[PDB]
Amino acid sequence: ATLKDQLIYNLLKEEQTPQNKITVVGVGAVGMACAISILMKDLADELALVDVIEDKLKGEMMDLQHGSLFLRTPKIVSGKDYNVTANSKLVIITAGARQQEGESRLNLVQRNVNIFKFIIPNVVKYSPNCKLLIVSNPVDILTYVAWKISGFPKNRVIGSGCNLDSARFRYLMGERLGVHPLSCHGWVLGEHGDSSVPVWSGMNVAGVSLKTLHPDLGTDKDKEQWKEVHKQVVESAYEVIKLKGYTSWAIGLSVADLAESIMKNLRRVHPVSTMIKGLYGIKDDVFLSVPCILGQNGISDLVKVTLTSEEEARLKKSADTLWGIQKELQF
Template structure:
Protein backbone atom coordinates (compact mmCIF):
# COMPACT_ATOMS: atom_id res chain seq x y z
CA UNK A 1 0.00 0.00 0.00
CA UNK A 2 1.29 3.44 -0.90
CA UNK A 3 1.61 6.26 1.59
CA UNK A 4 0.33 9.56 0.26
CA UNK A 5 1.47 11.98 2.95
CA UNK A 6 2.49 15.17 1.23
CA UNK A 7 5.19 17.60 2.28
CA UNK A 8 7.00 14.98 4.35
CA UNK A 9 10.48 16.47 4.97
CA UNK A 10 11.91 13.01 5.62
CA UNK A 11 10.64 11.26 2.49
CA UNK A 12 13.27 9.26 0.65
CA UNK A 13 12.97 7.54 -2.73
CA UNK A 14 15.30 4.64 -3.47
CA UNK A 15 15.75 3.57 -7.08
CA UNK A 16 16.79 -0.07 -7.02
CA UNK A 17 15.53 -2.58 -4.47
CA UNK A 18 18.42 -5.01 -4.70
CA UNK A 19 20.85 -5.79 -1.89
CA UNK A 20 22.17 -2.24 -1.51
CA UNK A 21 18.80 -0.51 -1.99
CA UNK A 22 16.87 -2.74 0.41
CA UNK A 23 19.61 -2.67 3.04
CA UNK A 24 19.79 1.11 2.75
CA UNK A 25 16.05 1.29 3.41
CA UNK A 26 16.58 -0.94 6.44
CA UNK A 27 19.41 1.27 7.76
CA UNK A 28 17.33 4.43 7.28
CA UNK A 29 14.41 2.85 9.14
CA UNK A 30 16.38 1.41 12.05
CA UNK A 31 18.22 4.69 12.64
CA UNK A 32 14.99 6.70 12.48
CA UNK A 33 16.32 8.89 9.66
CA UNK A 34 13.47 8.49 7.16
CA UNK A 35 9.75 8.45 7.94
CA UNK A 36 8.63 7.58 4.40
CA UNK A 37 10.54 5.45 1.89
CA UNK A 38 9.48 4.68 -1.67
CA UNK A 39 11.20 1.62 -3.15
CA UNK A 40 11.30 1.72 -6.95
CA UNK A 41 12.54 -1.20 -9.00
CA UNK A 42 12.02 -2.64 -12.45
CA UNK A 43 11.12 -5.86 -10.63
CA UNK A 44 7.94 -4.70 -8.92
CA UNK A 45 7.44 -7.95 -7.04
CA UNK A 46 10.90 -7.61 -5.52
CA UNK A 47 10.17 -4.05 -4.39
CA UNK A 48 6.80 -5.08 -2.95
CA UNK A 49 8.34 -8.02 -1.11
CA UNK A 50 11.08 -5.86 0.40
CA UNK A 51 8.53 -3.23 1.46
CA UNK A 52 6.34 -5.86 3.13
CA UNK A 53 9.29 -7.37 4.97
CA UNK A 54 10.48 -3.98 6.22
CA UNK A 55 7.02 -2.84 7.30
CA UNK A 56 6.51 -5.98 9.36
CA UNK A 57 9.18 -4.71 11.74
CA UNK A 58 7.59 -1.30 12.18
CA UNK A 59 6.46 -1.97 15.75
CA UNK A 60 10.09 -2.16 16.87
CA UNK A 61 11.27 1.22 15.56
CA UNK A 62 10.29 4.85 15.17
CA UNK A 63 7.32 5.35 12.82
CA UNK A 64 8.26 4.80 9.20
CA UNK A 65 6.32 3.66 6.13
CA UNK A 66 7.87 1.82 3.23
CA UNK A 67 6.06 1.14 -0.01
CA UNK A 68 6.82 -0.08 -3.50
CA UNK A 69 6.23 2.50 -6.20
CA UNK A 70 7.27 3.79 -9.59
CA UNK A 71 9.06 6.91 -10.79
CA UNK A 72 6.04 9.06 -9.96
CA UNK A 73 6.75 8.30 -6.30
CA UNK A 74 9.90 10.39 -6.53
CA UNK A 75 7.55 13.35 -6.20
CA UNK A 76 7.99 15.05 -2.84
CA UNK A 77 11.17 13.21 -1.90
CA UNK A 78 13.92 15.36 -0.42
CA UNK A 79 16.58 12.81 -1.32
CA UNK A 80 16.53 10.33 -4.20
CA UNK A 81 19.03 7.50 -3.77
CA UNK A 82 20.11 5.61 -6.88
CA UNK A 83 21.39 2.08 -6.31
CA UNK A 84 20.10 0.58 -9.56
CA UNK A 85 22.44 -0.72 -12.20
CA UNK A 86 24.43 -3.73 -13.29
CA UNK A 87 26.26 -5.51 -10.47
CA UNK A 88 30.01 -5.82 -10.24
CA UNK A 89 31.13 -9.37 -11.02
CA UNK A 90 34.20 -11.18 -9.67
CA UNK A 91 37.41 -9.95 -11.39
CA UNK A 92 35.49 -6.98 -12.79
CA UNK A 93 36.57 -3.46 -11.82
CA UNK A 94 34.11 -0.67 -11.09
CA UNK A 95 35.21 1.06 -14.28
CA UNK A 96 34.28 -2.02 -16.30
CA UNK A 97 30.68 -1.24 -15.41
CA UNK A 98 30.68 2.24 -16.87
CA UNK A 99 29.21 1.62 -20.30
CA UNK A 100 26.45 -0.68 -19.09
CA UNK A 101 25.36 1.60 -16.29
CA UNK A 102 25.64 4.82 -18.28
CA UNK A 103 23.05 3.46 -20.70
CA UNK A 104 20.77 2.59 -17.79
CA UNK A 105 21.17 6.11 -16.37
CA UNK A 106 20.28 7.67 -19.73
CA UNK A 107 16.84 6.13 -19.35
CA UNK A 108 16.48 6.56 -15.61
CA UNK A 109 17.51 10.18 -14.94
CA UNK A 110 14.98 11.78 -17.34
CA UNK A 111 12.22 9.70 -15.70
CA UNK A 112 13.22 10.97 -12.26
CA UNK A 113 13.33 14.57 -13.49
CA UNK A 114 9.75 14.32 -14.79
CA UNK A 115 8.49 14.05 -11.22
CA UNK A 116 11.11 15.79 -9.09
CA UNK A 117 13.65 18.35 -10.20
CA UNK A 118 14.23 19.76 -6.73
CA UNK A 119 15.52 16.80 -4.72
CA UNK A 120 19.12 16.01 -3.88
CA UNK A 121 20.20 12.98 -5.90
CA UNK A 122 22.58 10.62 -4.14
CA UNK A 123 24.29 8.19 -6.52
CA UNK A 124 25.51 4.90 -5.09
CA UNK A 125 25.69 2.71 -8.22
CA UNK A 126 29.17 1.94 -9.53
CA UNK A 127 31.38 3.30 -10.93
CA UNK A 128 30.01 5.95 -8.59
CA UNK A 129 32.24 8.88 -9.56
CA UNK A 130 31.54 8.57 -13.27
CA UNK A 131 27.83 7.94 -12.72
CA UNK A 132 27.68 11.00 -10.45
CA UNK A 133 29.16 12.99 -13.32
CA UNK A 134 26.71 11.37 -15.76
CA UNK A 135 23.79 12.22 -13.46
CA UNK A 136 24.92 15.83 -13.17
CA UNK A 137 25.08 16.20 -16.95
CA UNK A 138 21.80 14.40 -17.68
CA UNK A 139 19.74 16.00 -14.91
CA UNK A 140 20.73 19.63 -15.37
CA UNK A 141 20.58 20.03 -11.57
CA UNK A 142 22.84 22.48 -9.74
CA UNK A 143 26.17 20.91 -8.78
CA UNK A 144 25.38 21.00 -5.07
CA UNK A 145 22.35 18.73 -5.58
CA UNK A 146 24.14 15.80 -7.21
CA UNK A 147 26.23 13.76 -4.79
CA UNK A 148 28.01 10.44 -5.06
CA UNK A 149 28.56 8.18 -2.06
CA UNK A 150 32.19 8.43 -3.10
CA UNK A 151 34.81 7.26 -0.61
CA UNK A 152 32.66 7.57 2.53
CA UNK A 153 32.76 3.77 2.80
CA UNK A 154 36.46 3.59 1.90
CA UNK A 155 37.23 6.15 4.61
CA UNK A 156 35.29 4.04 7.10
CA UNK A 157 37.23 0.94 6.06
CA UNK A 158 40.43 2.96 6.47
CA UNK A 159 39.47 4.05 9.99
CA UNK A 160 38.35 0.54 10.91
CA UNK A 161 41.64 -1.05 9.86
CA UNK A 162 43.71 1.58 11.65
CA UNK A 163 41.60 1.11 14.78
CA UNK A 164 42.26 -2.63 14.74
CA UNK A 165 45.96 -2.12 14.14
CA UNK A 166 46.25 0.37 17.01
CA UNK A 167 43.58 -1.21 19.24
CA UNK A 168 41.52 1.94 19.69
CA UNK A 169 37.87 2.58 18.85
CA UNK A 170 37.23 3.46 15.21
CA UNK A 171 35.31 6.53 16.40
CA UNK A 172 38.61 7.92 17.77
CA UNK A 173 40.35 7.52 14.42
CA UNK A 174 40.00 10.30 11.87
CA UNK A 175 41.25 9.81 8.35
CA UNK A 176 40.23 10.08 4.72
CA UNK A 177 40.45 8.22 1.46
CA UNK A 178 40.18 10.68 -1.43
CA UNK A 179 39.93 10.51 -5.21
CA UNK A 180 38.17 7.68 -7.01
CA UNK A 181 36.05 5.12 -5.22
CA UNK A 182 38.17 2.45 -6.81
CA UNK A 183 41.66 1.36 -7.73
CA UNK A 184 43.24 4.83 -7.92
CA UNK A 185 41.98 6.00 -4.51
CA UNK A 186 44.43 7.79 -2.23
CA UNK A 187 44.87 7.33 1.55
CA UNK A 188 45.62 10.67 3.21
CA UNK A 189 48.07 9.65 5.91
CA UNK A 190 49.25 13.23 6.43
CA UNK A 191 45.84 14.23 7.86
CA UNK A 192 45.11 10.99 9.72
CA UNK A 193 44.97 11.30 13.50
CA UNK A 194 43.96 9.41 16.61
CA UNK A 195 42.30 11.49 19.33
CA UNK A 196 43.50 14.65 17.62
CA UNK A 197 47.13 13.48 17.51
CA UNK A 198 48.85 12.85 14.17
CA UNK A 199 49.93 9.27 13.55
CA UNK A 200 53.57 10.33 13.45
CA UNK A 201 53.22 11.56 17.03
CA UNK A 202 50.81 8.88 18.22
CA UNK A 203 52.61 5.77 16.93
CA UNK A 204 55.76 6.12 19.10
CA UNK A 205 53.65 5.96 22.28
CA UNK A 206 50.99 3.39 21.30
CA UNK A 207 53.33 0.34 21.30
CA UNK A 208 51.90 -1.04 18.05
CA UNK A 209 53.57 -1.14 14.70
CA UNK A 210 52.43 1.37 12.11
CA UNK A 211 55.47 1.80 9.92
CA UNK A 212 55.55 2.23 6.16
CA UNK A 213 54.94 -1.47 5.48
CA UNK A 214 51.97 -1.53 7.87
CA UNK A 215 50.54 1.55 6.17
CA UNK A 216 50.96 0.00 2.74
CA UNK A 217 49.15 -3.13 3.93
CA UNK A 218 46.27 -1.12 5.39
CA UNK A 219 45.91 0.93 2.18
CA UNK A 220 45.98 -2.27 0.11
CA UNK A 221 43.28 -3.87 2.26
CA UNK A 222 41.06 -0.79 1.91
CA UNK A 223 41.45 -0.83 -1.86
CA UNK A 224 40.81 -4.55 -2.28
CA UNK A 225 38.12 -5.07 0.38
CA UNK A 226 35.22 -4.97 -2.07
CA UNK A 227 36.87 -7.48 -4.39
CA UNK A 228 37.40 -9.90 -1.50
CA UNK A 229 33.83 -9.54 -0.25
CA UNK A 230 32.39 -10.01 -3.76
CA UNK A 231 34.54 -13.13 -4.22
CA UNK A 232 33.39 -14.58 -0.89
CA UNK A 233 29.68 -13.63 -0.77
CA UNK A 234 28.78 -12.19 -4.16
CA UNK A 235 28.17 -8.53 -3.27
CA UNK A 236 28.66 -5.82 -0.68
CA UNK A 237 25.71 -4.09 0.95
CA UNK A 238 25.79 -3.78 4.77
CA UNK A 239 28.60 -1.26 5.14
CA UNK A 240 27.66 0.75 2.06
CA UNK A 241 24.08 1.00 3.33
CA UNK A 242 25.37 2.42 6.61
CA UNK A 243 27.55 4.87 4.67
CA UNK A 244 24.56 6.02 2.62
CA UNK A 245 22.44 6.40 5.75
CA UNK A 246 25.19 8.56 7.24
CA UNK A 247 25.13 10.87 4.21
CA UNK A 248 21.32 11.09 4.23
CA UNK A 249 21.32 11.92 7.93
CA UNK A 250 23.66 14.83 7.33
CA UNK A 251 21.34 16.13 4.60
CA UNK A 252 18.01 15.74 6.37
CA UNK A 253 19.30 17.04 9.71
CA UNK A 254 21.34 19.86 8.17
CA UNK A 255 24.41 18.67 10.10
CA UNK A 256 27.24 20.34 8.17
CA UNK A 257 29.13 17.07 8.56
CA UNK A 258 32.44 16.58 6.77
CA UNK A 259 32.19 13.48 4.57
CA UNK A 260 34.24 12.29 1.61
CA UNK A 261 31.38 12.33 -0.88
CA UNK A 262 31.93 12.60 -4.62
CA UNK A 263 31.02 15.87 -6.33
CA UNK A 264 32.04 18.09 -9.23
CA UNK A 265 35.58 19.43 -8.98
CA UNK A 266 36.05 23.09 -9.88
CA UNK A 267 39.77 23.66 -9.59
CA UNK A 268 40.59 21.83 -6.38
CA UNK A 269 44.28 20.88 -6.67
CA UNK A 270 44.00 21.96 -10.31
CA UNK A 271 41.28 19.39 -11.13
CA UNK A 272 38.14 20.40 -13.03
CA UNK A 273 35.10 18.88 -14.76
CA UNK A 274 35.10 15.47 -13.09
CA UNK A 275 33.46 14.09 -9.95
CA UNK A 276 35.77 12.86 -7.22
CA UNK A 277 35.84 12.59 -3.44
CA UNK A 278 37.36 15.14 -1.10
CA UNK A 279 36.40 16.06 2.48
CA UNK A 280 33.16 17.96 1.94
CA UNK A 281 30.69 19.83 4.14
CA UNK A 282 27.28 18.22 3.61
CA UNK A 283 24.01 19.78 4.79
CA UNK A 284 20.41 20.32 3.72
CA UNK A 285 21.56 22.05 0.53
CA UNK A 286 23.62 19.01 -0.43
CA UNK A 287 27.18 20.07 -1.10
CA UNK A 288 27.89 23.16 0.94
CA UNK A 289 31.63 23.32 0.38
CA UNK A 290 34.42 21.09 -0.91
CA UNK A 291 37.46 21.45 1.33
CA UNK A 292 40.93 21.83 -0.17
CA UNK A 293 43.03 20.75 2.79
CA UNK A 294 46.85 20.65 2.77
CA UNK A 295 48.14 17.37 1.32
CA UNK A 296 51.68 16.16 1.03
CA UNK A 297 53.08 16.16 -2.55
CA UNK A 298 52.62 12.41 -3.06
CA UNK A 299 48.98 12.55 -1.95
CA UNK A 300 48.21 15.53 -4.17
CA UNK A 301 49.88 13.81 -7.11
CA UNK A 302 47.82 10.67 -6.41
CA UNK A 303 44.60 12.67 -6.36
CA UNK A 304 45.44 14.32 -9.71
CA UNK A 305 46.29 10.91 -11.18
CA UNK A 306 42.95 9.57 -9.94
CA UNK A 307 41.16 12.45 -11.67
CA UNK A 308 43.02 11.83 -14.92
CA UNK A 309 42.16 8.13 -14.78
CA UNK A 310 38.46 8.92 -14.55
CA UNK A 311 38.64 11.63 -17.21
CA UNK A 312 40.05 9.15 -19.70
CA UNK A 313 36.95 7.05 -19.17
CA UNK A 314 34.45 9.91 -19.42
CA UNK A 315 35.96 10.97 -22.74
CA UNK A 316 34.58 7.74 -24.19
CA UNK A 317 31.02 8.48 -23.10
CA UNK A 318 28.33 10.11 -25.21
CA UNK A 319 26.14 12.26 -22.99
Protein backbone atom coordinates in the same frame (compact mmCIF):
# COMPACT_ATOMS: atom_id res chain seq x y z
CA ALA B 1 -21.60 3.33 8.94
CA THR B 2 -18.40 1.31 8.65
CA LEU B 3 -16.55 0.08 11.70
CA LYS B 4 -13.83 2.64 10.93
CA ASP B 5 -16.40 5.45 11.02
CA GLN B 6 -18.05 3.95 14.13
CA LEU B 7 -14.69 4.03 15.90
CA ILE B 8 -13.09 7.18 14.48
CA TYR B 9 -14.46 10.69 13.93
CA ASN B 10 -12.56 12.51 11.17
CA LEU B 11 -11.59 16.18 11.62
CA LEU B 12 -9.44 16.68 8.53
CA LYS B 13 -9.63 15.67 4.92
CA GLU B 14 -5.90 16.25 4.82
CA GLU B 15 -3.22 16.82 2.21
CA GLN B 16 -1.06 13.70 2.46
CA THR B 17 2.01 15.82 1.72
CA PRO B 18 5.45 14.30 2.46
CA GLN B 19 7.86 16.35 4.54
CA ASN B 20 10.98 14.22 5.05
CA LYS B 21 10.81 11.75 2.19
CA ILE B 22 13.62 9.57 0.84
CA THR B 23 13.62 7.40 -2.29
CA VAL B 24 15.92 4.44 -2.98
CA VAL B 25 16.15 3.38 -6.65
CA GLY B 26 17.37 -0.20 -7.12
CA VAL B 27 16.39 -2.77 -4.50
CA GLY B 28 19.33 -5.12 -4.77
CA ALA B 29 21.29 -6.01 -1.66
CA VAL B 30 22.78 -2.49 -1.55
CA GLY B 31 19.50 -0.63 -2.02
CA MET B 32 17.77 -2.70 0.67
CA ALA B 33 20.68 -2.29 3.09
CA CYS B 34 20.38 1.47 2.60
CA ALA B 35 16.62 1.17 3.14
CA ILE B 36 16.78 -0.82 6.37
CA SER B 37 19.57 1.43 7.67
CA ILE B 38 17.57 4.59 6.95
CA LEU B 39 14.48 3.02 8.54
CA MET B 40 16.29 2.02 11.71
CA LYS B 41 17.79 5.51 12.05
CA ASP B 42 14.35 7.23 11.78
CA LEU B 43 15.55 9.59 9.04
CA ALA B 44 12.45 9.73 6.84
CA ASP B 45 8.71 10.07 7.32
CA GLU B 46 8.14 8.37 3.95
CA LEU B 47 10.29 5.86 2.07
CA ALA B 48 9.80 5.09 -1.63
CA LEU B 49 11.41 2.15 -3.44
CA VAL B 50 11.80 1.91 -7.24
CA ASP B 51 13.11 -0.91 -9.43
CA VAL B 52 12.39 -2.49 -12.81
CA ILE B 53 11.91 -6.01 -11.40
CA GLU B 54 8.28 -5.77 -10.34
CA ASP B 55 7.83 -8.87 -8.16
CA LYS B 56 11.06 -8.35 -6.22
CA LEU B 57 10.14 -4.69 -5.65
CA LYS B 58 6.68 -5.46 -4.27
CA GLY B 59 8.04 -8.27 -2.10
CA GLU B 60 10.71 -6.08 -0.54
CA MET B 61 8.20 -3.30 0.09
CA MET B 62 5.80 -5.76 1.75
CA ASP B 63 8.56 -7.26 3.88
CA LEU B 64 9.43 -3.77 5.17
CA GLN B 65 5.75 -2.93 5.72
CA HIS B 66 5.27 -6.05 7.85
CA GLY B 67 7.90 -4.61 10.18
CA SER B 68 6.09 -1.25 10.55
CA LEU B 69 5.21 -2.02 14.17
CA PHE B 70 8.95 -1.89 14.98
CA LEU B 71 9.70 1.30 13.02
CA ARG B 72 8.87 5.02 13.11
CA THR B 73 8.52 5.59 9.35
CA PRO B 74 4.76 5.54 8.80
CA LYS B 75 4.62 5.31 4.98
CA ILE B 76 6.54 2.87 2.79
CA VAL B 77 5.66 2.81 -0.90
CA SER B 78 7.08 1.33 -4.09
CA GLY B 79 6.45 1.20 -7.81
CA LYS B 80 8.07 1.23 -11.23
CA ASP B 81 6.36 4.57 -11.88
CA TYR B 82 8.28 7.51 -10.48
CA ASN B 83 5.13 9.24 -9.27
CA VAL B 84 5.72 7.25 -6.09
CA THR B 85 8.93 9.27 -5.64
CA ALA B 86 7.33 12.73 -5.81
CA ASN B 87 8.66 15.40 -3.45
CA SER B 88 11.63 13.42 -2.13
CA LYS B 89 14.20 15.43 -0.20
CA LEU B 90 16.86 12.83 -1.01
CA VAL B 91 17.02 10.27 -3.81
CA ILE B 92 19.58 7.48 -3.52
CA ILE B 93 20.61 5.65 -6.70
CA THR B 94 21.80 2.07 -6.18
CA ALA B 95 20.59 0.67 -9.51
CA GLY B 96 22.86 -1.15 -11.93
CA ALA B 97 23.26 -3.98 -14.41
CA ARG B 98 24.49 -7.48 -13.59
CA GLN B 99 28.02 -8.15 -14.82
CA GLN B 100 27.88 -11.25 -16.98
CA GLU B 101 30.25 -14.17 -16.47
CA GLY B 102 33.60 -13.72 -18.22
CA GLU B 103 32.96 -10.18 -19.45
CA SER B 104 35.00 -7.22 -18.25
CA ARG B 105 33.51 -4.74 -15.82
CA LEU B 106 34.37 -2.01 -18.34
CA ASN B 107 31.32 -3.20 -20.28
CA LEU B 108 29.18 -2.20 -17.28
CA VAL B 109 29.88 1.54 -17.49
CA GLN B 110 27.79 2.23 -20.57
CA ARG B 111 25.14 -0.26 -19.47
CA ASN B 112 24.78 1.68 -16.21
CA VAL B 113 24.86 4.98 -18.13
CA ASN B 114 21.90 3.70 -20.16
CA ILE B 115 20.15 2.79 -16.90
CA PHE B 116 20.81 6.30 -15.58
CA LYS B 117 19.46 7.79 -18.83
CA PHE B 118 16.11 6.30 -17.84
CA ILE B 119 16.28 6.88 -14.07
CA ILE B 120 17.62 10.40 -13.65
CA PRO B 121 15.12 12.36 -15.81
CA ASN B 122 12.27 10.62 -13.99
CA VAL B 123 13.77 11.50 -10.60
CA VAL B 124 14.05 15.14 -11.66
CA LYS B 125 10.53 15.16 -13.10
CA TYR B 126 8.99 14.30 -9.71
CA SER B 127 11.55 15.80 -7.26
CA PRO B 128 13.18 18.75 -9.06
CA ASN B 129 14.54 20.10 -5.73
CA CYS B 130 15.95 16.86 -4.30
CA LYS B 131 19.52 16.00 -3.46
CA LEU B 132 20.85 13.07 -5.52
CA LEU B 133 23.14 10.58 -3.77
CA ILE B 134 24.79 8.19 -6.23
CA VAL B 135 26.06 4.80 -5.01
CA SER B 136 26.11 2.67 -8.19
CA ASN B 137 29.58 1.80 -9.48
CA PRO B 138 31.69 3.05 -10.99
CA VAL B 139 30.50 5.73 -8.58
CA ASP B 140 32.71 8.69 -9.49
CA ILE B 141 31.91 8.29 -13.20
CA LEU B 142 28.21 7.67 -12.58
CA THR B 143 27.98 10.67 -10.26
CA TYR B 144 29.26 12.81 -13.13
CA VAL B 145 26.70 11.13 -15.41
CA ALA B 146 23.87 11.76 -12.94
CA TRP B 147 24.96 15.40 -12.56
CA LYS B 148 24.98 15.92 -16.35
CA ILE B 149 21.60 14.29 -16.96
CA SER B 150 19.84 15.90 -13.97
CA GLY B 151 20.96 19.45 -14.76
CA PHE B 152 21.26 20.03 -11.00
CA PRO B 153 23.79 22.42 -9.45
CA LYS B 154 26.80 20.58 -8.08
CA ASN B 155 25.77 21.05 -4.43
CA ARG B 156 22.80 18.70 -5.00
CA VAL B 157 24.64 15.79 -6.69
CA ILE B 158 26.71 13.71 -4.25
CA GLY B 159 28.68 10.54 -4.89
CA SER B 160 28.99 8.17 -1.95
CA GLY B 161 32.66 8.16 -2.98
CA CYS B 162 35.20 7.41 -0.26
CA ASN B 163 32.91 7.66 2.77
CA LEU B 164 32.93 3.85 2.90
CA ASP B 165 36.65 3.65 2.02
CA SER B 166 37.41 5.99 4.92
CA ALA B 167 35.18 3.98 7.28
CA ARG B 168 37.13 0.83 6.35
CA PHE B 169 40.39 2.74 6.85
CA ARG B 170 39.33 3.81 10.34
CA TYR B 171 38.12 0.31 11.17
CA LEU B 172 41.50 -1.19 10.18
CA MET B 173 43.35 1.60 11.98
CA GLY B 174 41.31 0.89 15.11
CA GLU B 175 42.09 -2.83 14.87
CA ARG B 176 45.81 -2.03 14.89
CA LEU B 177 45.60 0.41 17.80
CA GLY B 178 42.94 -1.19 20.01
CA VAL B 179 40.80 1.98 19.75
CA HIS B 180 37.21 2.32 18.52
CA PRO B 181 37.11 3.63 14.91
CA LEU B 182 35.13 6.67 16.15
CA SER B 183 38.33 7.84 17.90
CA CYS B 184 40.62 6.82 15.00
CA HIS B 185 40.81 9.57 12.39
CA GLY B 186 42.15 9.27 8.87
CA TRP B 187 40.99 10.21 5.38
CA VAL B 188 40.88 8.30 2.10
CA LEU B 189 40.26 10.67 -0.83
CA GLY B 190 39.99 10.65 -4.61
CA GLU B 191 38.50 7.71 -6.47
CA HIS B 192 36.46 5.05 -4.71
CA GLY B 193 38.27 1.73 -4.39
CA ASP B 194 41.37 0.85 -6.40
CA SER B 195 42.90 4.29 -6.95
CA SER B 196 41.96 5.99 -3.67
CA VAL B 197 44.50 8.15 -1.85
CA PRO B 198 45.23 7.74 1.90
CA VAL B 199 46.16 11.11 3.44
CA TRP B 200 48.82 9.97 5.91
CA SER B 201 49.33 13.52 7.27
CA GLY B 202 45.79 13.47 8.69
CA MET B 203 45.88 10.13 10.46
CA ASN B 204 45.63 10.79 14.20
CA VAL B 205 44.25 9.78 17.57
CA ALA B 206 43.29 12.57 20.00
CA GLY B 207 44.92 15.12 17.71
CA VAL B 208 48.29 13.34 17.79
CA SER B 209 49.75 13.09 14.28
CA LEU B 210 50.83 9.50 13.59
CA LYS B 211 52.97 10.78 10.72
CA THR B 212 54.85 13.06 13.11
CA LEU B 213 55.21 10.28 15.71
CA HIS B 214 56.30 7.80 13.04
CA PRO B 215 57.88 9.54 10.04
CA ASP B 216 58.06 6.35 7.98
CA LEU B 217 54.24 6.24 8.08
CA GLY B 218 52.88 5.60 4.61
CA THR B 219 56.22 4.71 3.01
CA ASP B 220 57.42 1.34 1.77
CA LYS B 221 60.33 1.14 4.23
CA ASP B 222 58.01 1.47 7.24
CA LYS B 223 59.01 -1.62 9.22
CA GLU B 224 55.45 -1.69 10.61
CA GLN B 225 53.98 -1.41 7.08
CA TRP B 226 51.19 1.03 7.84
CA LYS B 227 50.70 1.32 4.08
CA GLU B 228 49.11 -2.14 4.36
CA VAL B 229 46.24 -0.38 6.15
CA HIS B 230 45.34 1.39 2.93
CA LYS B 231 46.12 -1.68 0.81
CA GLN B 232 43.54 -3.52 2.92
CA VAL B 233 41.02 -0.69 2.40
CA VAL B 234 40.98 -1.84 -1.22
CA GLU B 235 41.65 -5.57 -0.92
CA SER B 236 39.21 -6.21 1.95
CA ALA B 237 36.42 -4.96 -0.32
CA TYR B 238 37.42 -7.42 -3.04
CA GLU B 239 37.70 -10.10 -0.35
CA VAL B 240 34.14 -9.57 0.89
CA ILE B 241 32.93 -9.72 -2.71
CA LYS B 242 34.76 -13.00 -3.20
CA LEU B 243 33.59 -14.44 0.13
CA LYS B 244 29.86 -13.57 0.08
CA GLY B 245 29.38 -12.45 -3.54
CA TYR B 246 28.84 -8.70 -2.97
CA THR B 247 29.01 -6.12 -0.21
CA SER B 248 25.94 -4.55 1.38
CA TRP B 249 25.94 -3.89 5.14
CA ALA B 250 28.82 -1.41 5.39
CA ILE B 251 27.72 0.63 2.36
CA GLY B 252 24.16 0.66 3.71
CA LEU B 253 25.44 2.08 6.99
CA SER B 254 27.72 4.52 5.12
CA VAL B 255 24.81 5.79 3.00
CA ALA B 256 22.59 6.20 6.07
CA ASP B 257 25.37 8.25 7.69
CA LEU B 258 25.37 10.59 4.66
CA ALA B 259 21.57 10.71 4.69
CA GLU B 260 21.64 11.63 8.38
CA SER B 261 23.78 14.72 7.81
CA ILE B 262 21.66 15.74 4.81
CA MET B 263 18.21 15.18 6.33
CA LYS B 264 19.10 16.69 9.71
CA ASN B 265 21.22 19.55 8.28
CA LEU B 266 24.12 18.56 10.51
CA ARG B 267 27.00 20.13 8.52
CA ARG B 268 29.27 17.26 9.41
CA VAL B 269 32.28 16.66 7.15
CA HIS B 270 32.28 13.52 4.99
CA PRO B 271 34.62 12.31 2.21
CA VAL B 272 32.09 12.21 -0.64
CA SER B 273 32.53 12.64 -4.38
CA THR B 274 31.88 16.17 -5.63
CA MET B 275 32.46 18.10 -8.85
CA ILE B 276 36.02 19.19 -8.23
CA LYS B 277 36.98 21.26 -11.28
CA GLY B 278 38.88 24.33 -10.15
CA LEU B 279 41.07 22.50 -7.60
CA TYR B 280 44.43 20.74 -7.77
CA GLY B 281 45.02 21.82 -11.34
CA ILE B 282 41.95 19.76 -12.25
CA LYS B 283 40.54 21.53 -15.30
CA ASP B 284 37.91 18.95 -16.28
CA ASP B 285 34.39 18.22 -15.06
CA VAL B 286 35.08 15.21 -12.84
CA PHE B 287 33.90 13.99 -9.45
CA LEU B 288 36.41 13.02 -6.72
CA SER B 289 36.09 12.55 -2.98
CA VAL B 290 37.29 15.42 -0.78
CA PRO B 291 35.98 16.27 2.72
CA CYS B 292 32.62 17.98 2.17
CA ILE B 293 30.24 19.70 4.56
CA LEU B 294 26.85 17.98 4.14
CA GLY B 295 23.50 19.45 5.08
CA GLN B 296 20.03 20.26 3.86
CA ASN B 297 21.31 21.85 0.63
CA GLY B 298 23.69 18.97 -0.12
CA ILE B 299 27.37 19.92 -0.31
CA SER B 300 27.54 23.55 0.85
CA ASP B 301 31.31 23.76 1.45
CA LEU B 302 34.41 21.63 1.20
CA VAL B 303 37.66 21.41 3.12
CA LYS B 304 40.87 22.21 1.23
CA VAL B 305 43.17 19.46 2.50
CA THR B 306 46.84 20.37 2.29
CA LEU B 307 48.33 17.66 0.08
CA THR B 308 51.85 16.54 -0.64
CA SER B 309 53.06 16.88 -4.23
CA GLU B 310 52.58 13.12 -4.71
CA GLU B 311 49.04 13.22 -3.30
CA GLU B 312 48.10 16.15 -5.53
CA ALA B 313 49.54 14.40 -8.59
CA ARG B 314 47.54 11.25 -7.87
CA LEU B 315 44.33 13.30 -7.77
CA LYS B 316 45.25 15.03 -11.05
CA LYS B 317 45.96 11.66 -12.68
CA SER B 318 42.61 10.33 -11.44
CA ALA B 319 40.90 13.35 -12.95
CA ASP B 320 42.62 12.61 -16.26
CA THR B 321 41.50 8.96 -16.32
CA LEU B 322 37.96 9.91 -15.32
CA TRP B 323 37.86 12.54 -18.07
CA GLY B 324 39.24 10.05 -20.60
CA ILE B 325 36.50 7.50 -19.98
CA GLN B 326 33.75 10.10 -19.62
CA LYS B 327 34.41 11.56 -23.04
CA GLU B 328 33.69 8.08 -24.52
CA LEU B 329 30.30 7.65 -22.80
CA GLN B 330 27.12 8.11 -24.86
CA PHE B 331 24.44 10.35 -23.33
